[PDB]
Amino acid sequence: HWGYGKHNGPEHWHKDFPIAKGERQSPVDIDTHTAKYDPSLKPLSVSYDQATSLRILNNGHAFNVEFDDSQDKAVLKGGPLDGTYRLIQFHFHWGSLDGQGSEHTVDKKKYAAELHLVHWNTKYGDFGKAVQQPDGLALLGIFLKVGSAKPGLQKVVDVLDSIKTKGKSADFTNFDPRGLLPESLDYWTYPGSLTTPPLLECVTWIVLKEPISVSSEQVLKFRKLNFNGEGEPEELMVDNWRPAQPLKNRQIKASFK
């Protein structure tokens, strides 16, 4: 099956998932000089005050912090979006070294990591139905650079030892994802896709311009995770990022002047 190893990585995905060579694939490089300010874009509305985290799972390609999305609690609205999108999970992509790890790039710059908060459009009733629609998901992307620690990330990093290997999960209640947001909600937006198989073209991307800072110790702990299952030969979970894809017939819009 697909992965990020030497023989099943992103350059191989198209064989099982032909949409990998599609017209609206993600991630992409954000060329800051070509992205146009769009005065018609509204402020993002991130309402996470009532977010209910439940569990954290190592799924063999990342770790997902999962939320209770059976009610309208943690929602993303406004910005380029029409309607309401419910938070279902967040996860990260990171590198083996600080000089790579992010999926989106900014003027070809790679960040050390990238956070994805995944939300589905409530007009489609459930996540499974939403991913079959061009406006089914809204993904909020946030870059991580290495510097000062992010206090709000530490509860995530400290639980990672308990989910080292594929298929392991742990209770993870009462985690507040507001602690992962940067100061500014300025963003770029474009239509794209899931960045892991099945690579469905169902995502409105909202990528924040301001990165958050995390410490070297924090990201080092990400890199102690395993792609493999318990008892199997150790493959460190690093470089679980898909590289930039062709922009094709798309425009990236900026929310800021």
Give the footprint of Zn ion on this chain (CB under 5 A). 116
Comparing CB distances to Zn ion, the nearer of 116 and 209 is 116
46 pairs with which residues across the strands?
76
Are the C-beta atoms of 208 and 254 separated by less than 8 Å? no
Is 61 tagged catalytic? yes
Annotated binding-site residues read 91, 93, 116, 195-196
Comparing CB distances to Zn ion, the nearer of 46 and 199 is 199
Question: Least distance in Å: CB of 156 to Zn ion?
Answer: 15
Closest residue by beta carbon to Zn ion: 116
210-239 burial string, b = 16+ CB within 10 Å, else e? Answer: ebbebbeebbebbbebbbbeeeeeebebbb
Question: Least distance in Å: CB of 159 to Zn ion?
Answer: 19
Spot the catalytic one: 7, 14, 33, 61: 61
Comparing CB distances to Zn ion, the nearer of 44 and 62 is 62
Question: Least distance in Å: CB of 171 to Zn ion?
Answer: 23
Helices marked H in 95-153: 127-130
Taking the C-alpha atoms of residue 187 and residue 141, their distance in angstroms, rounded to an integer, is 9
Taking the C-alpha atoms of residue 119 and residue 127, their distance in angstroms, rounded to an integer, is 9
Comparing CB distances to Zn ion, the nearer of 89 and 226 is 89
**Three-state DSSP state, 194:** coil
- For the chain, the straight-line distance linking the first and the last C-alpha, in angstroms and rounded, comes to 44
Annotated binding-site residues for Zn(2+) read 91, 93, 116
Please list the active-site residues: 61
